[PDB]
Amino acid sequence: PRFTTGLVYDTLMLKHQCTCGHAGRIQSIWSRLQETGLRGKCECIRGRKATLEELQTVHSEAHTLLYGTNPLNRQKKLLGSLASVFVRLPCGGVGVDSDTIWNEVHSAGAARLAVGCVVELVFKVATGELKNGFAVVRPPGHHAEESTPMGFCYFNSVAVAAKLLQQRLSVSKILIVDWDVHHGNGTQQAFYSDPSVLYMSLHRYDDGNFFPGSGAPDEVGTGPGVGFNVNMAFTGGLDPPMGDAEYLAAFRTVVMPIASEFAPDVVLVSSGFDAVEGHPTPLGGYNLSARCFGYLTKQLMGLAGGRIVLALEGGHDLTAICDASEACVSALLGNELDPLPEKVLQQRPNANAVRSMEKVMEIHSKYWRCLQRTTSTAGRSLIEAQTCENE
Numbered sequence: 001p002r003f004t005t006g007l008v009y010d011t012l013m014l015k016h017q018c019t020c021g022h023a024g025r026i027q028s029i030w031s032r033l034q035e036t037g038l039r040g041k042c043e044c045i046r047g048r049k050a051t052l053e054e055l056q057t058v059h060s061e062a063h064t065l066l067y068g069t070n071p072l073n074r075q076k077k078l079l080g081s082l083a084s085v086f087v088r089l090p091c092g093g094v095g096v097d098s099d100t101i102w103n104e105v106h107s108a109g110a111a112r113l114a115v116g117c118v119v120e121l122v123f124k125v126a127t128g129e130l131k132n133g134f135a136v137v138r139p140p141g142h143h144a145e146e147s148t149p150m151g152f153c154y155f156n157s158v159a160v161a162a163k164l165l166q167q168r169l170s171v172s173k174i175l176i177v178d179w180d181v182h183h184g185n186g187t188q189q190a191f192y193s194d195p196s197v198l199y200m201s202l203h204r205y206d207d208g209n210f211f212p213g214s215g216a217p218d219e220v221g222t223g224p225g226v227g228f229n230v231n232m233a234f235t236g237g238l239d240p241p242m243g244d245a246e247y248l249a250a251f252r253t254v255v256m257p258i259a260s261e262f263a264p265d266v267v268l269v270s271s272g273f274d275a276v277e278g279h280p281t282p283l284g285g286y287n288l289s290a291r292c293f294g295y296l297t298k299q300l301m302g303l304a305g306g307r308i309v310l311a312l313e314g315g316h317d318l319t320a321i322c323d324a325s326e327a328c329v330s331a332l333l334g335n336e337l338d339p340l341p342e343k344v345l346q347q348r349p350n351a352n353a354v355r356s357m358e359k360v361m362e363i364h365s366k367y368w369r370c371l372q373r374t375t376s377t378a379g380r381s382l383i384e385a386q387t388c389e390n391e
């Protein structure tokens with residue numbers, strides 16, 4: 001059926017395409033979606049390069065021309081330049097040579113394609129051509145600032161897509177949720193003074209001591225945007241690590257009450273999976289299950305009438321990102337999800353997480369009615385919170 005979940009992917013984002021895939025992140029996720037038959041139930045959407053004008057909704061002209069255009073256009077030596085871009089591999093295939101100067105050039109070109117791929121999917125959902133969508137896209141975008149690439153990001157795909165929704169379709173309210181384990185500093189910057197888009201980040205913060213070092217609970221916006229930047233910053237380190245119970249409690253007490261009050265017209269998700277188990281201690285440190293992300297997706301699908309697009313950001317462990325991508329797409333298709341273990345449903349969130357949640361709720365009680373009514377119940381398990389709503 002055509003009114004269903006869309007997927008966007010493009011082999012031109014790959015360093016090396018290879019049958020029987022070795023094989024990087026997005027090629028592996030695409031295979032898992034193909035192999036499980038989820039792609040078959042989905043509408044596959046054709047991507048394209050973002051235009052230079054589209055990238056300039058977020059980034060400076062200078063940034064866009066430097067990283068967004070083929071350097072050879074400014075310049076026997078052509079045949080020699082083309083030759084060393086490529087290398088023949090032990091599978092008998094060819095790829096972009098990762099040991100050369102073309103590694104970062106190609107990644108920036110991949111980034112330009114990633115933005116257009118996301119824009120295409122977002123517009124089909126926002127317009128009702130599609131219901132839902134997931135963008136299988138690389139590199140990530142959420143750390144790229146107006147004039148600064150960083151943390152493997154060149155262009156902020158999700159922020160560009162939001163700017164174009166506002167400028168082309170006049171979308172009144174957009175919610176961006178960012179659940180990559182790292183703060184989306186780029187996205188925060190792009191909308192910091194704008195009350196028409198609510199940015200909500202869940203991230204490891206530990207009082208400024210985790211990459212990229214931004215995203216304090218204090219940072220609530222500037223000007224008329226005051227109140228519309230929510231940093232659900234976890235602090236306390238890994239004593240113990242954050243897991244399913246902690247993120248589920250954060251959705252119950254902070255994310256869903258604020259997002260529900262805001263009442264967005266479209267939801268965009270910066271969907272990194274580096275919080276799932278399999279991402280050791282400097283990269284991630286947390287141990288969410290892949291299946292928890294299927295549940296978080298289903299929660300957000302209750303907003304904006306279900307007009308939601310998830311865009312892959314970080315995540316490295318192949319099993320983890322494939323398990324998680326599978327759970328999110330399955331949720332978007334409306335399939336029944338694997339139930340969360342009794343263990344997770346019974347578990348009270350750890351003390352560091354409760355403290356973190358209460359700090360944010362305190363700061364944002366000033367700006368949201370849903371946090372003015374009551375006392376905190378952040379320390380309850382899901383079963384307990386369920387039990388103690390009734391009577």
Ligand SMILES: O=C(NO)c1ccc(C(=O)N2CCn3c(-c4ccccc4)cnc3C2)s1
Pocket residue numbers: 140151152182211274282283313314315
């Ligand atoms: O998830 C991501 N992008 O999607 C990340 C971007 C940047 C990340 C990050 O934490 N970095 C800090 C660690 N690091 C390193 C390290 C270099 C030596 C030892 C440990 C880490 C190189 N580059 C980085 C970027 S994760």
Ligand SMILES: [K+]
Pocket residue numbers: 178179180181182183184201202203
């Ligand atoms: K985040």
Ligand SMILES: [K+]
Pocket residue numbers: 191192193194195197198199221225228229
């Ligand atoms: K904002």
Ligand SMILES: [Zn+2]
Pocket residue numbers: 016017018019022089091092093
């Ligand atoms: Zn190969």
Ligand SMILES: [Zn+2]
Pocket residue numbers: 180181182272274313314315
């Ligand atoms: Zn990340």
